[PDB]
Design a protein around this ligand. Structure first.
Ligand code: CHL
Ligand code: CLA
Ligand code: CLA
Ligand code: CLA
Ligand code: CLA
Ligand code: CLA
Ligand code: CLA
Ligand code: CLA
Ligand SMILES: CC(/C=C/C=C(C)/C=C/[C@@]12O[C@]1(C)C[C@@H](O)CC2(C)C)=C\C=C\C=C(C)\C=C\C=C(C)\C=C\[C@@]12O[C@]1(C)C[C@@H](O)CC2(C)C
Ligand SMILES: CC(/C=C/C=C(C)/C=C/[C@@]12O[C@]1(C)C[C@@H](O)CC2(C)C)=C\C=C\C=C(C)\C=C\C=C(C)\C=C\[C@@]12O[C@]1(C)C[C@@H](O)CC2(C)C
Lengths: 41, 201, 196, 152
């Protein structure tokens, strides 16, 4: 559906999807490497 | 317009006019109302059919021959746990490279039809198929059956689609049967044939 | 000329008049003609330097199979003692390369302005293109046809990728570029980036 | 010893903080059977605390008189991982985001109704533009040289 695809490109839905994926990535990154205070490499 | 319908007495969708092979007017949700989605979905269905037919053959023919005792192959469910000549990740990477070259050229033929019909190395060699998803030529149609009158084609292309759909259903059935009953698919058939009234879910 | 990806269209600014033009610019850096003019020279110089770098990093290690010399690895060549201190050599290198690269740079700005010798005025480079000086830089008078330029660019790109591989492998494996090849050739299916 | 600080590995107050935290965690474990899930969670917490303290000891941080790590941001090479490298990474990422936004804004400026492309995003064009920001420093610097960065 073209209209359904248009509704998925509206600002709030796109922002929600982007921020959900971003939060998931950050949570997993902090889960794999906990308590980072310095960049050791 | 007078073709048999999935729901007799009803009205088929407007975008399904009966021009495609294997068309019965089944699209309640309108997932392919626009032409581009229609083409993409047709190509996806054709590829899923062809992989599911290879998978159904490979799941069921080996397992049957093991039961009658001619071969001694392991279960298809745990076939990925045996130890082969190398680690599984290396095989996955080789697969990824080869299938990436194979599928990458298939992507360009969907976007721009008839642009990848020439051999990059030996330009004397060509594919002959006019239709996206039916490539033809000496590689994919060595017997030359894949071309003919529209009557000869709309039968063969409908036979392919009807077989592929059945294979997809069978493959998913085998997966869920092994998940639930915890035994190979052929044992389930013999159990059902032994006591059809009670050998059931 | 050729397409880097069949089924895709070439950019408008890549008209095929340049050597080694395969229409590869997914990120559109060379849209501005000034950017293209600068990047052509950048690619030429980078490839020409990388080819020599790879040739010097590989062959002095191939000696092991033939056993002519005894030379340390390319990553241990610096620590060896030489007739002069490292600082003095670096200073001399800087002094010479400053003049050389400033002389080269002036041709990109105003072509044909640095073709004359500064001390002996009777000596001058024949007129040529921006990145191809010619003259005494081409003693054997080989014709700079487009085929040779395309070969040069292809070799430069391959050598640049080879140098990147040489750098990355040492950080992980810790051995030489040639030793990495023999180990792979011993057991090909077990000795890859996937160690297992 | 910058500013009269001491390394974490030689600090007694750091060890006392670790011991106090571990002892506080261990007093809660005595309330549960060893096989129960809360005991497993408390064991994991204790192990993680020990690992965190060991890692802070290994990285060469500096402690004060309270046994707490302090950060040096003056540019000394011995502490570049505290401020410099994350700063450069953040600058790269922020420049990427800003460059992608500017490119998308410029791309749709010539349309008939540019406002409607801001409330309903054109997904394919943004997706094509998204990858281009990976080389934002070179593009931005060359645009600055050519004079196309600043509006006339
Ligand atoms: C390009 C280039 C790269 C990637 C390196 C990289 C390296 N140099 Mg090096 N150098 C380079 C050009 C030059 N170096 C040197 C002079 C030295 C010296 C004296 C030393 C290095 C050393 C090193 C290593 C430091 C660790 C590393 C392999 C060190 C090394 O080899 O330790 C293992 C070392 O002692 N380089 C000169 C002459 C001024 C160069 C031109
Ligand atoms: C409980 C089971 C379970 C397990 C074992 C994992 C494991 C993982 N998840 Mg995950 N996840 C789960 C449940 C689980 N998830 C649930 C219930 C949700 C909500 C629906 C998510 C939502 C989620 C998101 C949104 C993301 C992950 C990601 C990841 C991977 C992080 C490692 C990484 O970035 O390396 C790279 C990834 C791999 C090596 C393999 C993947 C890791 C493999 C991240 C990921 O895949 O990163 C790319 C990521 O972005 N997960
Ligand atoms: C500009 C302000 C700012 C800055 C520079 C930081 C910086 C940091 N925070 Mg942070 N944080 C902030 C505001 C800030 N925070 C705010 C406002 C909150 C409340 C929502 C948090 C909540 C928070 C948590 C819960 C955690 C961090 C953590 C961290 C560290 C991240 C480690 C990593 O790999 O990622 C890093 C030093 C992590 C850490 O372990 O730090 C040592 C961590 O677990 N932060
Ligand atoms: C990738 C894992 C894997 C492995 C280990 C095997 C292993 C095997 N397959 Mg097989 N197969 C696979 C994937 C695999 N297959 C896939 C993905 C398809 C599709 C098939 C389709 C297939 C068919 C159609 C047949 C086999 C057969 C066989 C057996 C004979 C080997 C020779 O030839 C052997 C046990 C043959 C057999 O008789 O099975 C016992 C046979 O006729 N396979
Ligand atoms: C019920 C099973 C079935 C049936 C009836 C067909 C029937 C057909 N396939 Mg086919 N195919 C199948 C399964 C099937 N396929 C599977 C499982 C795969 C994946 C391995 C393929 C892969 C495949 C390719 C790649 C091509 C065909 C083509 C064709 C057509 C001409 C080939 C032919 O029959 O002449 C025998 C020769 C014909 C309509 C060709 C076509 O339509 O182009 C002319 C073609 O290029 N098929
Ligand atoms: C091609 C499709 C197909 C076929 C032929 C079978 C056949 C069979 N299944 Mg089965 N199954 C399927 C799909 C299929 N399944 C799918 C998709 C699932 C996932 C939901 C399951 C889940 C499943 C479980 C959990 C169990 C079986 C079991 C069985 C066997 C006993 C009959 C029974 O109670 O099943 C009931 C069948 C269903 C609930 C699925 C509905 C059938 C699908 C929709 C296809 C319908 C057939 C078709 C329309 C008729 C014409 C084609 C015909 C020639 C097959 C029998 C051999 C049982 C067993 O192990 O046997 C002892 C058992 O416990 N199946
Ligand atoms: C470009 C390039 C650069 C920067 C170098 C730089 C170097 N080469 Mg060298 N080399 C190059 C190309 C290059 N090479 C090529 C193309 C060949 C062929 C060689 C063959 C070669 C040999 C055979 C030796 C060097 C050695 C050396 C080192 C000491 C000699 C010196 O420069 O005084 C020095 C790091 C010497 C070395 O590493 O030991 C002192 C040495 O024995 N090179
Ligand atoms: C012309 C380019 C070139 C060639 C011929 C090779 C060849 C080789 N590399 Mg290699 N490599 C390259 C570029 C190249 N590399 C680059 C650019 C990188 C950086 C991303 C690496 C990073 C790399 C690692 C980390 C490792 C190798 C290893 C190896 C050896 C085993 C093969 C393997 O695992 O492939 C690995 C292939 C890749 C990582 C992909 C590179 C991209 C391809 C090669 C571009 C060329 C087409 C083999 C001799 C392994 C080794 O030492 O074996 C003992 C190993 O562990 N390479
Ligand atoms: C897609 C699929 C299911 C389809 C779903 C349907 C009907 C949806 C229908 C509708 O959309 C329509 C039409 C119109 C809409 O308005 C309404 C709905 C209702 C939404 C099943 C299978 C889809 C895909 C399948 C079957 C995949 C096959 C897998 C293979 C090849 C496996 C191979 C191997 O088994 C071997 C051979 C050997 C082993 O050792 C190893 C492995 C690798 C396991
Ligand atoms: C010059 C060079 C290296 C030279 C090395 C030299 C001299 C080494 C000398 C040494 O060894 C010796 C000799 C002595 C040894 O003892 C010591 C040292 C001194 C160490 C590398 C260039 C290296 C250059 C490299 C790798 C460049 C890679 C660039 C790529 C891939 C660009 C890709 C794109 O650019 C396009 C095509 C289009 C964009 O639109 C799309 C993208 C995708 C962005």
């Amino acid at each position: 559906m073209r209209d359904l695809k248009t509704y998925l490109s509206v600002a709030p839905v796109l922002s929600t999807l982007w921020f959900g994926s971003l939060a998931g990535l950050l949570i997993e990154i902090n889960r794999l490497f906990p308590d980072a205070l310095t960049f050791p490499f | 317009p007078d073709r048999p319908i999935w729901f007799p007495g009803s009205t088929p969708p407007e975008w399904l006019d009966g021009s495609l092979p294997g068309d019965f007017g089944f699209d309640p949700l309108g997932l392919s109302s626009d032409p581009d989605s229609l083409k993409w979905n047709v190509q996806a269905e054709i590829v899923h059919c062809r992989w599911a037919m290879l998978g159904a053959a490979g799941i069921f023919i080996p397992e049957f021959l093991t039961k009658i005792g001619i071969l001694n192959t392991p279960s298809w469910y745990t076939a990925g746990e045996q130890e082969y000549f190398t680690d599984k990740t290396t095989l996955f990477v080789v697969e990824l490279i080869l299938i990436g070259w194979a599928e990458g050229r298939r992507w360009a033929d969907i976007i721009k039809p008839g642009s990848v019909n020439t051999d990059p190395v030996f330009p004397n060699n060509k594919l002959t198929g006019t239709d996206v998803g039916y490539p033809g030529g000496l590689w994919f149609d060595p017997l030359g059956w894949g071309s003919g009158s529209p009557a000869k084609l709309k039968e063969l292309r409908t036979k392919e689609i009807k077989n592929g759909r059945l294979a997809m259903l069978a493959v998913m059935g085998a997966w869920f049967q092994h998940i639930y009953t915890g035994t190979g698919p052929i044992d389930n058939l013999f159990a059902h044939l032994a006591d059809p009234g009670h050998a059931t879910i | 000329k050729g397409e880097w990806l069949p089924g895709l269209a070439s950019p408008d600014y890549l008209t095929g008049s340049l050597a080694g033009d395969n229409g590869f610019d997914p990120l559109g850096l060379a849209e501005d003609p000034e950017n293209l003019k600068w990047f052509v020279q950048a690619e030429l110089v980078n490839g020409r330097w990388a080819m020599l770098g790879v040739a010097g990093m590989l062959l002095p290690e191939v000696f092991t199979k033939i056993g002519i010399i005894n030379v340390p690895e390319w990553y241990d060549a610096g620590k060896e003692q030489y007739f002069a201190s490292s600082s003095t050599l670096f200073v001399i290198e800087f002094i010479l390369f400053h003049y050389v690269e400033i002389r080269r740079w002036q041709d990109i700005k105003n072509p044909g302005s640095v073709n004359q010798d500064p001390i002996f005025k009777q000596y001058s480079l024949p007129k040529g293109e921006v990145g191809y000086p010619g003259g005494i830089f081409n003693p054997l008078n080989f014709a700079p046809t487009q085929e040779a330029k395309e070969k040069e660019l292809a070799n430069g790109r391959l050598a640049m990728l080879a140098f990147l591989g040489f750098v990355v492998q040492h950080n992980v494996t810790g051995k030489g570029p040639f030793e990495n090849l023999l180990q792979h050739l011993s057991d090909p299916w077990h000795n890859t980036i996937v160690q297992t | 010893d910058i500013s009269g600080l001491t390394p974490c590995k030689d600090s007694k107050q750091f060890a006392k903080r670790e011991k106090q935290q571990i002892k506080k965690l261990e007093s809660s474990l005595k309330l549960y059977a060893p096989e129960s899930a809360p005991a497993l969670a408390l064991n994991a917490q204790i192990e993680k605390t020990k690992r965190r303290f060991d890692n802070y000891g290994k990285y060469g941080l500096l402690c004060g008189s309270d046994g707490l790590p302090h950060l040096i941001v003056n540019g000394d090479q011995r502490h570049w991982g505290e401020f410099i490298t994350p700063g450069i990474l953040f600058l790269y990422i922020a420049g990427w985001i800003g460059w992608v936004g500017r490119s998308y804004l410029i791309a749709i400026s010539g349309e008939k109704k540019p406002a409607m492309k801001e409330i309903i995003i054109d997904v394919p064009l943004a997706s094509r533009i998204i990858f281009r920001g990976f080389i934002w420093p070179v593009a931005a610097y060359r645009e600055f040289l050519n004079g196309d960065l600043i509006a006339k």
